[PDB]
Design a protein around this ligand. Structure first.
Ligand SMILES: CC(=O)SCCNC(=O)CCNC(=O)[C@H](O)C(C)(C)COP(=O)(O)OP(=O)(O)OC[C@H]1O[C@@H](n2cnc3c(N)ncnc32)[C@H](O)[C@@H]1OP(=O)(O)O
Ligand SMILES: [Cl-]
Length: 154
């Protein structure tokens, strides 16, 4: 059986163990960007940091009770009127079923009053670049060797 509708649950520091597990079930992403899997202590610290920023919009992605991804954006960056998506991750066993597109469309639906939505891609990740272009994000610039910027009007 399949749950179809993806729920976007706002993340809090008590979610650290669940977000840790999502990252640990996504090893290929961390290898691609040249990083060890995050420690639980690292995930806690990162959640404490986003907790105190009123403009961060971060979510665990749920199918029923199962955490199957993570979405992290910042309103008001690069400009006050815009938003930027810094991470969209679907757990590796749930990739290729349209959940990335669903998460993006559900998130963008909530941004009436925002002007443009940027996405920043880290490292040599052409698969992610192909995904964002397919969803209507055009290339803006590269941000040095490690970063590439894309944008979609709302
Ligand atoms: C702005 C950024 O987040 S760049 C980083 C993007 N994330 C990754 O590359 C992590 C690995 N990949 C994934 O998590 C997914 O394959 C995504 C998000 C790129 C696409 O989602 P999918 O559900 O596989 O794509 P769909 O089937 O909707 O087409
Ligand atoms: Cl459903």
């Amino acid at each position: 059986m399949h749950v179809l509708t993806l729920d976007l649950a706002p993340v809090t520091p008590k979610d650290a163990p669940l977000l840790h597990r999502v990252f640990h079930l996504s090893p290929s992403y961390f290898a691609l960007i040249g990083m060890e899997l995050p420690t639980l202590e690292d995930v806690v610290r990162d959640l404490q940091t986003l907790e105190v920023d009123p403009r961060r919009r971060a979510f665990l992605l749920f199918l029923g009770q199962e955490p199957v991804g993570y979405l992290d954006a910042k309103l008001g960056y690069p400009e006050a009127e815009d938003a930027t998506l810094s991470l969209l991750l679907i757990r590796e066993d749930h990739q290729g079923r349209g959940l990335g597109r669903q998460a993006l469309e559900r998130f963008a639906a909530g941004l009436d009053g925002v002007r443009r939505l940027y996405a920043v891609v880290y490292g040599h990740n052409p698969k992610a670049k192909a995904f964002f272009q397919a969803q209507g994000f055009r290339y803006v610039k590269d941000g040095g060797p490690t970063l590439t910027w894309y944008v979609r009007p709302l």
